[PDB]
Amino acid sequence: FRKFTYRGVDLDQLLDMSYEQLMQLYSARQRRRLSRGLRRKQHSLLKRLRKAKKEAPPMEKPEVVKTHLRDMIILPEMVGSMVGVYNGKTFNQVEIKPEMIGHYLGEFSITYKPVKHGRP
Amino acid sequence: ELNEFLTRELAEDGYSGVEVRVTPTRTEIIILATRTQNVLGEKGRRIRELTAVVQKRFGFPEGSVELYAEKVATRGLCAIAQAESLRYKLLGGLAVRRACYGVLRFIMESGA
Amino acid sequence: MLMPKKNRIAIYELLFKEGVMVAKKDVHMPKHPELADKNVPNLHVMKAMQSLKSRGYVKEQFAWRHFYWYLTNEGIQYLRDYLHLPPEIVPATLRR
Amino acid sequence: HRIRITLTSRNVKSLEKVCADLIRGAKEKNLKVKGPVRMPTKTLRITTRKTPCGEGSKTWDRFQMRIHKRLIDLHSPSEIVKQITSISIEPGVEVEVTIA
Amino acid sequence: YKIPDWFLNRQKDVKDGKYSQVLANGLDNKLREDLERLKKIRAHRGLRHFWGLRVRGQHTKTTGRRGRT
Amino acid sequence: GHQQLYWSHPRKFGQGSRSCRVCSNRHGLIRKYGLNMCRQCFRQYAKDIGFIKLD
Amino acid sequence: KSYTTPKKNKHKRKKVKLAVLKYYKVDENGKISRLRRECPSDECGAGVFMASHFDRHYCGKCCLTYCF
RNA sequence: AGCGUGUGCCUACCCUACGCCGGCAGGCGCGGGUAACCCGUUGAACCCCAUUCGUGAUGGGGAUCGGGGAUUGCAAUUAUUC
RNA sequence: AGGAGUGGAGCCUGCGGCUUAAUUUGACUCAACACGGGAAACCUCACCCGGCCCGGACACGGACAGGAUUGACAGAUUGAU
């Protein structure tokens, strides 16, 4: 029932932000990630990945576009999206919640299995 | 690297070693072998090809490298030449004890 | 080996200008240092002179990481009737 | 002119012999010459394991490379310096001449 | 009272976004809701905190024997 | 895009950007004084370079 | 190695029968007509030509793709 | 204090005095050294002197864990390092 | 005769075991176990899940200048423009 927020600003305001102050709203590692340079060297995948986020169906649940990139900064442009991220074997489908901004897709997809021991 | 290159190439003529002597604006590398008539080839073809490959590999100015080949006396007192001779005698097909006795008798006939 | 015709020719008049050829065994290198005026990698040189070795016109030697090739008289004659040469030009390794 | 001649080599006996030859030439040419200044030597130590694999007692090798350097000053024009340095040079000794 | 902002144990909080030093029961409440938020978003850190293992990324083959019997 | 993806991974650093100048093995490199060999090739070729055992 | 999954194939390239004679049109009079487009770049002056697609015209190597 | 090391081959990546900004981690202009020449008279630690502490799992010990800020690198989440 | 200790406490690292798509592997008393100069985020990499190129020389027979063959932009498909 409560209204969701991230450093006090709202979701509509978070969509209506630019990257220059998104550095200061983000944390230290995420500001360095945005401030490294132009995203072209290894990040044409990141560019066209946000184009794939921008590509939208009609009023249903969005289609699950799947990735191989585990080091993505969660952006306000992809709130309420579905993505199946690679963990080595399968693609872990996940809802991008509006509490996750400032994280990585490699955190919500566990790579190893939970270990259940037996006998020596 | 130079000594390795010549001990791979000149395994037939009894290679021993190199001697690189430095001169103002000149480098020359003395080659001591056994068959000094065979290292040169016909009208010095092979020595010219060796100068050319050294100049093109080691990054030297053109015309600054001149190789010289000379023969050494007392072939039985060189360990590398007798080892190469025993290798050639075993590779052509011979008894190993026969070749070892022959090369040892040659070495002690050379005055060791 | 897919290879442009101009690179084959240019390698051949380099091989006939001076009767030796050297190359380092690496395939991920963009341009040959001696042919910096044009554009050809080391892979073309390695595979072309490997083909010419297999047809039997050069020697072969590997010291540390570099190649060493030496022309023979059948290789000389093959380059003389491949490059359309009148009988008056010889590589410098044969003359004094 | 302030002419400095630097000699750097690896052997010590041939270095001392060629330094004695140069100072003998400077003494017989009757000009002011500084003495053979002996810089402190430098050692190049490379310590490595003896075995190629990881089996055996932990034994290590100790390699060294001693480098000896001398410098002798002269008061003469340049042609005398070249004609006295290009006489009876040793193969294992480097000679290197500059002018300040 | 002229205390600089880098002397605080809770700088740039994830909910309200202001520098505020928190005290004992507030510290326990903030840590509890932070772990609850991590478990709700189901991150790797929240999953390791829920399981009760080492979360900072260190070797657990030998150290940490008194976790269970 | 094989011409662009053949060597697209950067090799400006790391131990795969270095290699021995004799056998080209990326293990146990000697980067002191620019020998750039492995330890076994250094022990093989140490005597004729000028390194001797005295200590 | 024959596996239970289906095996892919390289693209075989379809063979055209005398395509250059389809570019130049020869009528009964003394004139020559150019059906498809030409090349405007400085690398290829008048030599290579463009593709006859349904919604664009693609250059052979200069990549001057003009879409309608 | 004494052993050392220091601008590299295709090979890009050195050691740093001085001045300013910031608690600090760090950032920017300027110069030196291919070296008994510059870092550097290598103002190192343990020690010495003087306060605070007082036998208390304590100002011992710093494991575990949360938040923030910098640097390297194309990329750090399974926390690179600080 | 002694000194510092270790073995008990927390932590780093290596090995066995268990788990796992994979948790690559050699070494098991001295003479295996901060050993392979092995302080692996990518390369290392030799293990697993997926996709590109031939870097299959040379000889023989087909094949072919009326085309043996190389490369690619609109859009879908993964993972990759």
UniProtKB/Swiss-Prot annotation, chain A:
Covalent cross-link site, Glycyl lysine isopeptide (Lys-Gly) (interchain with G-Cter in SUMO2): K97
GO cellular component labels: cytosolic ribosome; cytosolic small ribosomal subunit
Gene Ontology MF term list: MDM2/MDM4 family protein binding; RNA binding; structural constituent of ribosome; ubiquitin ligase inhibitor activity
Major location (coarse): cytoplasm
Places the protein is found: Cytoplasm
Family: Belongs to the universal ribosomal protein uS19 family.
Described function: Component of the small ribosomal subunit. The ribosome is a large ribonucleoprotein complex responsible for the synthesis of proteins in the cell.
Species the sequence originates in: Oryctolagus cuniculus
A biological process from GO: rRNA processing
The name this protein goes by in its record: Small ribosomal subunit protein uS19
Record keywords, A-Z: Acetylation, Cytoplasm, Isopeptide bond, Ribonucleoprotein, Ribosomal protein, Ubl conjugation
Domain of life: Eukaryota
Subunit and interaction comment: Component of the small ribosomal subunit.
Swiss-Prot record, chain B:
PTM: Methylation by PRMT1 is required for import into the nucleolus and for ribosome assembly. Sumoylation by SUMO1 enhances protein stability through increased resistance to proteolysis.
Transmembrane segment boundaries: none
Known partners and oligomeric status: Component of the 40S small ribosomal subunit. Identified in a IGF2BP1-dependent mRNP granule complex containing untranslated mRNAs. Interacts with HNRPD. Interacts with PRMT1; the interaction methylates RPS3. Interacts with SUMO1; the interaction sumoylates RPS3. Interacts with UBC9. Interacts with CDK1; the interaction phosphorylates RPS3. Interacts with PRKCD; the interaction phosphorylates RPS3. Interacts with PKB/AKT; the interaction phosphorylates RPS3.
Compartments (UniProt record): Cytoplasm; Nucleus; Nucleus, Nucleolus; Mitochondrion inner membrane
Modified residues (N6-acetyllysine): K43
Keywords: Acetylation, Apoptosis, Cell cycle, Cell division, Cytoplasm, Cytoskeleton, DNA damage, DNA repair, DNA-binding, Isopeptide bond, Lyase, Membrane, Methylation, Mitochondrion, Mitochondrion inner membrane, Mitosis, Nucleus, Phosphoprotein, Ribonucleoprotein, Ribosomal protein, RNA-binding, Transcription, Transcription regulation, Translation regulation, Ubl conjugation
Any single GO BP term: cell division
Family: Belongs to the universal ribosomal protein uS3 family.
Gene encoding the protein: RPS3
Modified residues (Phosphothreonine): T23, T51
Molecular function, one GO term: structural constituent of ribosome
Organism: Oryctolagus cuniculus
Entry-annotated residues carrying Asymmetric dimethylarginine: R45, R46, R48
Crosslink feature (Glycyl lysine isopeptide (Lys-Gly) (interchain with G-Cter in ubiquitin)) location: K71
Record-annotated KH type-2 domain positions: 2-73
Swiss-Prot record, chain D:
GO biological process: translation
Disulfide bonds: none
UniProt keyword list: Acetylation, Cytoplasm, Isopeptide bond, Phosphoprotein, Ribonucleoprotein, Ribosomal protein, Ubl conjugation
Subcellular location: Cytoplasm
N6-acetyllysine: residues bearing it: K17, K58
GO CC terms: cytosolic ribosome; small ribosomal subunit
Modifications made to the protein after synthesis: Polyubiquitinated by ZNF598 via 'Lys-63'-linked ubiquitin chains when a ribosome has stalled, initiating the ribosome quality control (RQC) pathway to degrade the potentially detrimental aberrant nascent polypeptide. Deubiquitinated by OTUD3 and USP21, antagonizing ZNF598 activity. Ufmylated by UFL1.
GO molecular function: RNA binding; structural constituent of ribosome
Phosphoserine sites (modified residues): S76
Function recorded in the entry: Component of the small ribosomal subunit. The ribosome is a large ribonucleoprotein complex responsible for the synthesis of proteins in the cell.
Quaternary structure annotation from Swiss-Prot or TrEMBL: Component of the 40S small ribosomal subunit.
Family: Belongs to the universal ribosomal protein uS10 family.
Stated name of the protein: Small ribosomal subunit protein uS10
Organism: Oryctolagus cuniculus
Residue range from the parent sequence: 18 to 117 of 119
Curated annotation (Swiss-Prot), chain E:
Cross-link (Glycyl lysine isopeptide (Lys-Gly) (interchain with G-Cter in SUMO2)), chain numbering: K15, K18, K30
N6-acetyllysine: residues bearing it: K18, K30
Disulphide linkage map: none
Superkingdom of source: Eukaryota
Record's subcellular location: Cytoplasm
Subunit structure: Component of the small ribosomal subunit.
Protein family per UniProt: Belongs to the universal ribosomal protein uS13 family.
Function: Component of the small ribosomal subunit. The ribosome is a large ribonucleoprotein complex responsible for the synthesis of proteins in the cell.
Protein name, as recorded: Small ribosomal subunit protein uS13
Organism annotation: Oryctolagus cuniculus
Portion of the parent chain present: 77 to 145 of 152
